[PDB]
Amino acid sequence: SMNPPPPETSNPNKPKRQTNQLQYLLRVVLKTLWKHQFAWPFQQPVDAVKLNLPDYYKIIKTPMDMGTIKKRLENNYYWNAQECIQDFNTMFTNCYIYNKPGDDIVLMAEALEKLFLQKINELPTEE
Ligand SMILES: CCS(=O)(=O)Cc1cnc(Oc2ccc(F)cc2F)c(-c2cc(C)c3n2CC=NC3=O)c1
């Protein structure tokens, strides 16, 4: 029940790097999913307290949300686009695990994972 501490967004000793693709993940991919009608549930960590889901963090062990993605991008916390894409994947996977097919939150996710996959089909090249 009690809310764990969010995932970190800055880490002095982690190798950081700004690539063209990482720039794209924030400027085009993150910031177009953000505006979607179904983004809001995923714009910050899940508050198992506010929602009264004391079991969320007992089932979800790697939490992830577009809020901590947007914070990680803007902090250039990532080394390459793939680790940022992995955090999106974890976010969706989390939602399909704690929930079951047909739930409204899954519908929002399944959709967002569709929009996400369509937007990252074509990433920029490196200089
Ligand atoms: C994120 C801060 S917050 O204060 O908690 C706002 C918030 C409100 N409602 C939520 O659930 C629904 C969201 C839309 C629905 F149509 C129906 C929900 F039950 C959620 C939320 C986000 C995520 C990933 C999940 N949930 C709920 C259950 N499982 C989840 O995996 C979050």
Task: Give the method of determination.
Answer: X-ray
Hey, how many other C-beta atoms are within 10 angstroms of the C-beta on 84?
23
**Tokens for 45?**
């960590």
Q: 78 in ligand 1 pocket by Cβ < 6 Å?
A: no
Angle (CA) 8 29 72, round 5°: 15
Sign of the torsion formed by the C-alpha atoms of 120, 27, 37 and 41: positive
Name, in order, each residue with C-beta under 8 angstroms of 9's C-beta and a sequence gap of 6 or more: 68, 71, 72, 75, 77
Instruction: Please identify which residue in the block is written with the tokens 């074509």.
Output: 122
The structure was resolved to a resolution in Å of: 2.2
Q: 99 in ligand 1 pocket by Cβ < 6 Å?
A: yes
Q: 46 in ligand 1 pocket by Cβ < 6 Å?
A: yes
The atom number, within ligand 1, closest to the CA of 109 reads 24
The single-letter code of the amino acid at 22 is L
Q: 42 in ligand 1 pocket by Cβ < 6 Å?
A: yes
Question: Cα–Cα distance between 39 and 102 in angstroms, integer?
Answer: 18
Question: Cα–Cα distance between 75 and 69 in angstroms, integer?
Answer: 10
Query: In terms of Cα–Cα distance, which of 7, 4, 92, 85 is closest to 42?
Result: 92
The atom number, within ligand 1, closest to the CA of 48 reads 5
The single-letter code of the amino acid at 85 is I
- Roughly how many angstroms between the first and final C-alpha of the chain, as a whole number? 47
Ordered by where they begin, the domains of the chain are: 19-123 (1.20.920.10)
CA of 31 to the centre of ligand 1 (A): 20
CA of 53 to the centre of ligand 1 (A): 10
